[model samples]
Target: EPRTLPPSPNWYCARCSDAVPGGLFGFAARTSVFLVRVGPGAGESPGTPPFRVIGELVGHTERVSGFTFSHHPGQYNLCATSSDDGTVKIWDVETKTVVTEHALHQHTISTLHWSPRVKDLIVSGDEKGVVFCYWFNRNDSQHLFIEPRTIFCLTCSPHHEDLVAIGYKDGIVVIIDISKKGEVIHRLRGHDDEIHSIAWCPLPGEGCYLATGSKDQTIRIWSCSRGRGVMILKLPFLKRRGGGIDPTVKERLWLTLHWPSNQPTQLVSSCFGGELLQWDLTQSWRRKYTLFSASSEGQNHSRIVFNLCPLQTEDDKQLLLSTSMDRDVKCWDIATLECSWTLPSLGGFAYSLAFSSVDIGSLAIGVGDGMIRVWNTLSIKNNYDVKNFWQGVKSKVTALCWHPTKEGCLAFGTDDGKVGLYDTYSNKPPQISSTYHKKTVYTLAWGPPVPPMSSLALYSCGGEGIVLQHNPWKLSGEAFDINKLIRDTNSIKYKLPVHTEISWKADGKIMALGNEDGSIEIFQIPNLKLICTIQQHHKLVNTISWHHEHGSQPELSYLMASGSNNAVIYVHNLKTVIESSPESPVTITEPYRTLSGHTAKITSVAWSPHHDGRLVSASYDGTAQVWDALREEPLCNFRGHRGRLLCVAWSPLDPDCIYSGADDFCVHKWLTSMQDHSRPPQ
Candidate 1:
């Protein structure tokens, strides 16, 4: 396959797959979560923390609005996720199984709810205003149907069996009497604009009243006895203590409510300004208290809280658990109105949170990553407090790596293009220990070295074709001379280095760098001497990795495998280049074989540690393809992400197991042993 993008006229290249590498892949992990002071920093302030990826839930074509657990704790391991993709997918988390797949609507499936009383009943509302109640027991068939005006939210009453309420885009509330043949018997309407959320009041002897939140800037309490709204709780935009309230936070005047233990009398709501408000519906919709407010000092919460769950046990008191766009799940004590704990959801959106059967103090948070994290809330007390947990870098960290030899040394790269190395036990101030490129560092690879080594060298690449090799520990020292360490002749700036990829030979004697300009530059480390420059790719080289499986014996030449923008992997003999490349360009023999099948740019290419020919590659075309370097075609192609894939790596322990991180901010672990045919390459 050619490295250049194929012509658009070719059917196989209609999407210009080669030209679409970087843009198509979303982060495989979620962005860092931050709590912003919403009152004053809600406007166009540059310092305002915007909603970033916490993790990505791949496999959906559109926005995902509904996700819930099933009844069987093992089956509750099964999640039904419905998206605007017009489909509902039932996934078994333990087996990572896609149990059920069915289309929902031609439009978007806006909301989904799993019945609290019934075992297999699942309800979903769409933009078409059609509410579908699916009974998974009947082979996943639609059991009940009601077409309202652009359904927005749907919820089932926990107290009364067979009572389901549907909220519409036109602010009309329809309660269906599922107990009596699933009929819409009550219609409640009072708010203007779209009705976003609804909660069934679980109050005893309260006559089955409900709480509804709307974009109309009011939280309304609706009673089924009168089939109308009885109370409206309007929250005034409170002034900031010092900074004035930003008008941009003024729009979307609405609240979303949650209740503890089916209590219809009281409700908890979150506003667009990221403020939490509690209301006592039984007492004329009076405001209870504003939860911990936002502040410019990063103390206040940032982003809108998207979902809320009541934290309660059989004997324990009730508390509120909330998930937000800022990628945090926080727990608040109702009586104190103070946030007691905050759990950061790494990179993709923190879409949902639920109590897990796996652990009591541990809650399972479903992130955009498609994987649920069983977070232990007590991990907070293990000598790391929230205040000092993250104090090194001010900006959010995008990538991290642990030192193989050092006990407490860890290196982190950020989105703002800064890299820092810190020791967990370092008692002194741990600010940015070293700085290199001004642009974002996309990838970092450390040179090979055995344990007990005091110093290690790292190769870093970023935007504008800037590649730097430095020892973080040495770079920070006062006596280390930068001018002598870095060779001026080998450095290039302002060019777009395609992959910003770097790899060193087993002995750490030689290193190879791939540039966006499709040139492979081999350099001798420490002395920084240019060895050989090869113009192998017409387009950019996405990844370059070394293979030492040929062994250290002199009879076998060192091997190197490189994948290019065209999705072709080339395995070459590295031993020949060192012998003949000082005067003129050295030509090597034919590559062992070509690995193909990525429809777009190959963002990552990693060799299995245990197997010689086994390799895995991630592409911008939203698929991870595994290959045998000796074969002409890929062995298996795993399709999942809707966005471009950024990185992938093989598991160290399990040779058949592979973990891939993508631009979607999701990391997927797959088993290669399950490859079809299960045969070695011919």
Candidate 2:
């Protein structure tokens, strides 16, 4: 029945006297200790290893950038790690063994903390700005404190157990003390660039505050005693006139902070734009809840969000834990902010995270290829059980559409109003997700086959003023009611106009939309009447393509084209304005050709599923042109993104490819043949 015990004093291989009694004893390379058999029947049914790697610890050599654990009072398994090869090991989490390595710093060790009340000491911080405090088990020799520039970030001061703070790269924050030998005490200037994060504010206060996060996207809060100053906070304008300090926008930074051991004025953070938010410092630093967004899907990570622990559960419920650069490691649920668990990413890129002071389900992580792992977060088992392979796409995409019959599927939409669908043959995760729309979606189309649903529905529109539709095999969605299709327009301003581009009508029987003052309505598909309301651009209207009836002039097909913020593009013959007004509220006001060279504004427009009158737009001036809509100029001009540009597509199985998306979070791709068009513009 396999039950043999007794092997004392941490055995170290003498094959432990070669025990037998249960059929297989050991001596494989000097057995390091073994003896199983505990109470309940002792074998098989207790297995669980989908993730029990148990221990691996290997020496650094180059990547692991941070780690820590020794809450020393009884040593709770020792820990330590930091490395960029400049080394700092220390392990022994229950015999994964190594105990002392500390080459400390010739450069690279970016961060380390340990020493909740001094015992094996620790402290680190490098990347050339140095800042030591070693003593792993007493080697004595301390004294490093360097700092003249790049130390990126540092922490240590759960409640002043000898202070420490650090953070620089020109955005300084200092504050040392380290029991008076490293003594510097306070410098704190107002941030304008690098200083990735550095918290400290465990509550029970009277002064001593700190906080920091920078790269200038802001978040200050200092006050280290006496009468300090700083405070700031900002960040929350992911676009639209962007924000102050807007040097072409792109600055989200604020990567990691969590501080909520028991909510001392809250805190949370995480950002490089994949947001997570939640602050509160008793309200003057307000912004309390956005829990996570990078357009959701296990809450964020197209990159950055390196480490954020918090945890608490035993029924008090309050988890948080993060870690990213897309190597995931989620958890979140501070009272329903959602994402409960996810782990998946042990092949590197996760940059630092820790937990196990005595195992509240262990954790650890710290990767960038230099390895560290650990895991067992309560043995995982169900919070979708992990499996989101290559995530990326965290927000700012704004609208895409393709799946007419699912060749590579695609659907997109985000600026936080989410829509997703993806399926580029499948790395999986988002075969369909909707989250209706409370703000950005901007527009997405797809609808047809309306015969008791053999699939195909999905409409969508922006800023929530209604348009919805959905039906991805009955996952359901409704609200298309534009007053039940303008009930014959006894007309009191005929309603439904908060759109911003949307099209249809490849015989789906018509649909259009577009509005934000520069009108364009249309409607009539499956009883949604009101067909006609063109007014044309003077501002707003950005993109809408159409064309229809396939060549040889089936009476020159219903036409259409558009684009605006007044950088102009127009076109429109809608079968000569519906055979010269055949009904309900006709109002067209011009345009059969207009196309101009973008000097700015218009952001995205497509048409050209196979050329025939060609098109493509994208602008705010970081260029994307390519037109031919009966020419007025622009037959090429793609330019390398770097800002603005926003969204553009064309490739329905590559009629010479094309795809844009910008604000410098990049997505490019363009070819349009002509021998790659002489290759001079990027």
Candidate 3:
């Protein structure tokens, strides 16, 4: 795969990932980055929270190891993220797109910093002690490395745009002068273990105070100009107001040091053991008061407190943002010393994403933890869109299908072969799970509603060969025996292969099932009679979607597309190719148009309902490619997800827009063509 990008690509990468920075900004979650925004008030009705997740930036293929929101006022909406991919990707917070990417690091980028003073100055240090100072506006770079030492962290001096502190794993903090082309100013060594974090005191008048944290459980305040360690403070856990040290405070490695520019005499530090302590430089040597120390669920954080962001609310109060390993973020009213709000994590990996048939903006992704995360794509999407969450079967949700007519209803299938239906309008759990099959449920497709009938038709199939059709409140279904259906001609024996995917023809007369044995079987509906089989593919057929366009409206549906494990997509017309008549044994030999681009197996394919010959496909190669069946080649390749793409859907409203879900836990919106929509509207 190409690790580098073109010098002048027109389109930007979509940002469906990150951690927070601004009033509500992005934070790294797995391979994604999310942007959170504070709404009107904390005391809003129970339906609204004070702070909700606003958007996401998703492009990095690996977990974001180092990232920072830009501090320069001119570039306030820009944030940079670096990953183990050995490169840096710059994203716009407001638009949530990767503006550009830089690749020079030969190893994992351990730390990254955006200069508060210089707008275009960005720096990142790889583990090999190599540092790259990038002048982003001109796209030029300068790098420095010393004796193959591993660098742990980096911070640019807020006072001097030229100077930066580079903390190394060897427990040495090297001050490098970038303006002089990486000149070494001083190599300060005082800690016994690895240097974990460094922060330059943001004081203009005081000029030079540097805070450095180490795994040695010591924070050394270095006076750079004076060339000496002026103040040294051993790791002290939080002390209660009752005057006794909290015995629960265990010794921990340092995480980060924050010396706010406005509060010149005060400093705050975070530790690996979920402790956030404060220091008043002028008051005493070790008065580590607890601005905020949270504990167990008891709902409080009890593990590592990774970092903190001091926030200024538009109202009369200031806020502090803290993220922890307990998989939640807490916003504390710093002035009032109270936690005003907390945003829970997404809970687990997003396994399946499906767009609503009623509304294009209504999007839902089923997670591995069974949380159905909902998002609105129309404007500024907030995390509050979740209508249903934490379903009863809290296992990995693998299949999701939105109802064709029921606006608020959707069917979900789990890994344990549990299938159920839920209504978002009522925010209810499953009425009951259908447990006819004991293996993982991999496919869920809602059949079209027939006249005078409201009860839905849901077909669930998975790891096992059984295909269950729950209907008319029957809660159970007879297994469609593929083993019996795929019988040997004279031997009368069976070749049992599970159904990988199933799709209903528009008219509901024919049902197509993709099999693990690379065969596509068309069965007569209503009576569930076998029609014919198409068997040209050698690898397992993974996905199939039929494009129906006659006026029954699909009364004469024939065109179909099927994807395979061998990374090939074939378009077959039942009338032109199949030449079928039931009870008469028939097997189509060749597909009309062979669509191939993905190097890995195709996971899902969606035929465009509006456009003729337009299609979208998701693949294990981590790309969503648009195709013109007539052209038989990829029109545009959407590369954003770092992991395999599991599902995709064409937008019901916008003919050019499509959504793709991936193992990175993100569902990305892509504008198929580059000509019409230059940029997405907010």
Candidate 4:
């Protein structure tokens, strides 16, 4: 018998999957760039806030090392955070999500600082003795190595766009001009041990002042322009819990340094022993005061303070915030030296803190357990209050319809059987709300403006099996009560057999109702008289759309399309059914054409607002297809969604643009015109 052998593990190279002549097989690389927009768009409500917890970002698996807010113009809400995960992430303050992320460091990232004067530029240092300058807009980075020692701290000059001060483990500080190809401006050696922290003075009259703290238990002030140390302040020796201090023991190590923006000459520093010290730089750098030396919860020097940040409250009061290993964050009155508030019982050690420069009332805290919590510092009843409807109804949005006459006005239905109207121009609450249906609202549409009524009428249908019309102007003090009108109108009381979707024709004289029984019913407007019924689908009907004719045609010119749960599309010429006499009820038994390509159930269908013969459909198979209903084949197939396609629509303003929604909770915009241009015209 012949010997049989198992298949070799390395039979094929993985990189050879993209086969091409002369293409490198195993060592190919590529980069992808993407735009991430967070927060509400222009003209939407900013929302009310009382300094409550909004988002807890948990992207980093390791402890966050450092984070800084972007001061670049037009990017006030953007922030960059670095972590031991060897990656950096950019966040949107309002939306509370990581908008952009890049893996650029090989070791633990120690510090990250955004440029003060340049747009989209950030400087970061790692524990591997490497410093990198990144251009976010270009998605490119440049790195340089100063020495073999670990880079502990970094700071950018407040006045110069390119000047950077970096401190290393060997008690060495270097000032480099990053804009000029990383030119070394000055290198000064001043301390005996590792440098822990560095800060640049914010004052303009005082020439280029730089401060450094080191494990040698001393704070040294430097004048970068002169390249020399000006003053040195040594820390006091640590004392035992019982009695006398030991002169032979090492003093407490300085950990961080900061300059208050309001008082530029006042310098502040924290030590490993949990002491907060203030110094007057103008007067020989003399110690002004010691703010807090022990934790308010009675924890002594055992708890080490990690970060200090200054914030201005809504009423212009200065507050100093500090975080510590005691799992607490304390707020202090800057002038009175009194503890204002304490956030205790934090689950993990607080490692980092930052205040939003754009939103004064917002604060972010990073903890050792890989969580970032945000707070609002203002009261809930502040003058800037704007109610958000989503806060009350936490239901999924089921339907969305744009107003016909009002440009930015929109109406939406929810799964909780409620409807809401909002004007994007105003920052107030919903202008109109109604809970008329008993079950989930499945569809909503806007009808033409009726005479003598200033507001357009809204028509909605759902699992409740009844159609209701709403007038938004009634909410603005109109005499007519829309709820009472809906109750009094007998014409709108016709109940259907499991109506699940609803739509109106462009002429506003007819309406289509899709039922779960695989039937489509046509009703005449105002006095909803049943005109025609079609039962051409074998499965449940999911969506229906009517074609709009631009030129002169008969009043009974009926053209419509329907999609079913079995992934079949039917186009009908309904003129013959509408032209039948009233005594003879017309029923469509067969469709003029059938379009079948989807492998799963169809979810949505839309007729183009510009082209009369064009239609689009979305399916549960994660695909959207555009078809020319006049022909028998599909025009384009869109397949970017990773989950089931829930909805699709043709743009009203631009006939070539299409919008789709998916189960992945993402909305995608596709340009059909661009794809059309890529192919040669027939």
**What's the alpha carbon RMSD for model 2?**
25.8
Off by over 4 Å in 2: 1-126, 130-153, 165-305, 311-316, 327-329, 332-403, 407-544, 547-557, 562-566, 574-590, 593-601, 606-645, 648-661, 664-682
lDDT of 2 by residue, 1-682 (tens): 1111111111111001111111111111111212111112223343421111122344454445566566544665566766566767777755656777767478765677776667777888776777788877767547567565667667778666777778877887778777687777787888877777777777647656767777677778888884355577776664321111213324345455666767677777865544577777677645544645434553454444555655443335566655554444455777666665444433322222223323332333222232233433344343113222123344454555555665545555565666656554465555445345788777777876332334577777766655566665553343343444444443555555566777886777777777788788776656555558888796768777776466656654577788878777787877755555455668788887777777778866766656566777787777777778766546777665545666665544446656554543333445755323321233
Candidates in order have lDDT scores of 0.55, 0.57, 0.67, 0.59
lDDT by residue for model 1 (408-514), tens: 45555555666666554553434453655666655565674221223566656665456555556665632122223334544545533344656677567777877
Q: Candidate 3, 230: how far from true, in Å?
A: 18
Return the candidate ranking by TM-score, descending.
3, 1, 4, 2
Residue 72 lDDT in candidate 3: 66
Model 3: per-residue Cα lDDT over 1-682, one tens digit each: 0010001100001111223333555566666566666545323444434664456677777767776878766567888887876779887877888888899898877878888778888888887888998877788898877547888788888778898888887788889888887888877868787786787777754448788887787888887876678888776654323112224435445466767655778777765455666678886565545545343223234555566677765564566666664445667665555656656554555567787868666777777756566655553323323333555556788888888777777788888788877777774456555455578778887763332223456777877767666662555433343334334322334444567778887667777888888898886644445567888677878788888473234423587888888877888878733344556546888887788777888888887777777778888887887888867756777776566888887867688777777775555566776423211111
Candidate 4 stretches with Cα past 4 Å from truth are 1-395, 406-409, 424-428, 448-456, 473-496, 551-557, 676-682
Candidate 1 — worst ten consecutive residues by lDDT sum? 1-10
lDDT of 4 at 388: 19
Best-matching candidate per lDDT: 3
The RMSD (Cα, Å) of candidate 4 is 19.0
Q: What TM-score would candidate 4 get against the native?
A: 0.45
Pick by TM-score: 2 or 3, better one: 3
lDDT comparison, 3 vs 4, better candidate: 3
